[PDB]
Amino acid sequence: VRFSRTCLKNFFSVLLILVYLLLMGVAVFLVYQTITDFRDKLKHPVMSVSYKEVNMYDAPGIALYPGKARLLSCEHHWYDHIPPLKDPGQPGENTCVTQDISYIDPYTNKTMKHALIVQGPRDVRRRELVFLQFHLNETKQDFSAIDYLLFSSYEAFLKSHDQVKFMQDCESSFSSWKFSGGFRTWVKMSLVKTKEEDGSQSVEFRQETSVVNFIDRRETPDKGDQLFFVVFEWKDPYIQEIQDIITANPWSMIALLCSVFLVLFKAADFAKLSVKWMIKVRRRHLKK
Amino acid sequence: TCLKNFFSVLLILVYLLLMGVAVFLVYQTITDFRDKLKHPVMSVSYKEVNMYDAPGIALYPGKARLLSCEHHWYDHIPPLKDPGQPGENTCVTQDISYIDPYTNKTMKHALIVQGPRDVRRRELVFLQFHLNETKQDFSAIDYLLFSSYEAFLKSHDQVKFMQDCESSFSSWKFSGGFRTWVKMSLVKTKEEDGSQSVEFRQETSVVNFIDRRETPDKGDQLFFVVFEWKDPYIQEIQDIITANPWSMIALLCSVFLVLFKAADFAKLSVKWMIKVRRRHLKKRA
Amino acid sequence: RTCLKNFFSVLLILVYLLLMGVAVFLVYQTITDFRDKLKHPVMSVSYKEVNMYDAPGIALYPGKARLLSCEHHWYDHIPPLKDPGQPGENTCVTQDISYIDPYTNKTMKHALIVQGPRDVRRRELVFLQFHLNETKQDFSAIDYLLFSSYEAFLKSHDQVKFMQDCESSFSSWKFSGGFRTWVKMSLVKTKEEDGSQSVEFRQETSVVNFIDRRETPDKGDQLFFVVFEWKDPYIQEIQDIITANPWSMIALLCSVFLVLFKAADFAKLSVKWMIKVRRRHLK
């Protein structure tokens, strides 16, 4: 009976240990796959788009840096797809709110550059367009162009103090575009909204230009004369929203772990059922 | 005996904490379920298509009269012609003037032209226009891109059909006095109801024109225009929803079950613990 | 009255099976959802930062023109114009061989290459000046093609083949004469499903008019002006992602199977309670 009991105990032990080892192996396999999945989801968040419609935009900032030109004319034509042309080279007709501030360089910290800051169109439904014309007496230059830079608000500019920072931040963060010289450039602007971590919101300006030639037949072509025309208009009454989010949920992973534990227990319950069946076999052997 | 005082409160403290963790968990899952329902995600795919589906291009010359049509079968270097001579109406042109829907004031005129086909064969349409000099500066022509030119021909009430397209579409402007290269790409978006919409995108590029060959005195304008298909990879946009329609019910039910079954395990384990504690008290009694 | 309880037990057995009908409906919904998720892989965008970019490769087809300038500034934007037409100042790592176009299988193409900016803090802007005699086509246009690495071109053999695959991968942008063209270059990185990474180039032109009154080129000899300044020291990292893992879904279904079995345990208990109610009725 010694070796019969030895073989019975060995069979019981090997069956129980094999069941427990398969259980542990699948448990480690599942926990490994879950932890790599969690790391993968932590590594790469996923982005989301959305479109909202607003009735009217705030007043945006447009910081023109004319080299030596003077503001010949500016208007606020609304619905005026065909602006009333007139004789070029004639000053006046300035119905715009401006504020001429000159500040210093961030790179060399010496350039005492200026900025003829002008407001932008307010309502997209009104589809108002701002028409600006600049003339500069010709000086020896390979090409002539005036840059323009956009920032969020013409009104928060007013209430803000220490405006040197208020221009430094915009130029350091954003980049600059140069509307062409000798042509009329039609520029459509659309504000994009980007969600940033900690709940911070960022406004980034993007635009697509469209150049159209200008005929100087209405003026005598002479040295010392060059005209620029630039117009800004809100592209569409839609705001693009970018929200970067993380799909994985830690709690969801925990729920999956519990299901394996319950599965493991049910596996252990079936192993105990096998053990009690073998105990019944041993009872049959003893009663034999 | 102080042992009863020590022990007869944990049996309900475990209940209290298990309901607390359960309600916190269900709050978490309902909150993030609502969050995922509120903010969906978008997925982008590319489709390679051998079929053109010529869209058709709108044109509003206004005062200019087209001088030429050319349908370059496959040639990126057009032959030189005489700038100013008329003829060669080779485009599939259909003329339908219409009234303004948006201002309800002007008698608009349109020249619908069938779009280029065979992107792999790279057929490009070439049109040129001559306009007598006018007082107005910045002479330019407007154009619009609309799909399904043939379906437009089958369609009726075309005035309404053209009127809805202009409002929906951006209608970017086409330059004057400047040959322009326009490459248009087809993008397709999946709407909420399951239908799909079609939108156009273009990357313009302007090239200068040598008018030195021409001998102008009045100031006549001779702007050209060229359309071409870009990479035929049509982009499909489908904003899918997060995959938890019925799953999170399964997760919440499973976390309910684990605590329910561990409640009975807690009861039996504390019964065994109180039995062995009674044995310990008996041993040192 | 116990016969009605037996019939109620039979009805409990039948609700044991309408429940698994509900369960098979649910798992069919789950497998349809999985088949949907293996169809629409989501996309991910990452914005990494590079302190000093790789040397890019720019191919130009000057036709019958002649390169006249390779001025690599340091931080100056104001270019001192010496003479519109003078040759020299070729301080650029240029190189050229004649290539044969495979598309027509007969066209021979000549392309000279340029080292490129390669740095963003320096914001190098290679400056090229081209002069060409009067032509008949009446549209002076020069085609410029961009690829990832200039240095990979020189060391690798099969330079003809190296041209014969950097042909349709990019769109072969073209710039025009008579105008200074400001091309701002940026690259995006796309991760292949096999683990490869594909480089892509994106550009945003901005043309500026030119004044020819400084030389009076009455004949028609056109000029060209191209810069290649980098836009930002950022790289768009595009990686696709797969939403669903089969093992992760498997668990939810397994949990449901356990719950239904547990529910049956309780449900048989409920039938015993109906039997317990019947005994009180018998009293």
UniProtKB/Swiss-Prot annotation, chain B:
Segments in the Extracellular topological domain: 27-239
Taxonomic superkingdom: Eukaryota
Cellular compartments per GO CC: chloride channel complex; plasma membrane
GO biological process, one term: chloride transport
Subcellular localization, as worded in the UniProt entry: Cell membrane
Protein family according to the UniProt entry: Belongs to the proton-activated chloride channel family.
Catalytic function, reaction form: chloride(in) = chloride(out)
Cytoplasmic face of the membrane: 261-285
Membrane topology, as annotated: Multi-pass membrane protein
GO MF annotation terms: pH-gated chloride channel activity
Residue ranges of the TM segments: 6-26, 240-260
Protein name: Proton-activated chloride channel
Keywords from the named record: Cell membrane, Chloride, Chloride channel, Ion channel, Ion transport, Membrane, Transmembrane, Transmembrane helix, Transport
Job of this protein: Chloride channel gated by pH that facilitates the entry of chloride ions into cells upon exposure to extracellular acidic pH.
Main location: membrane
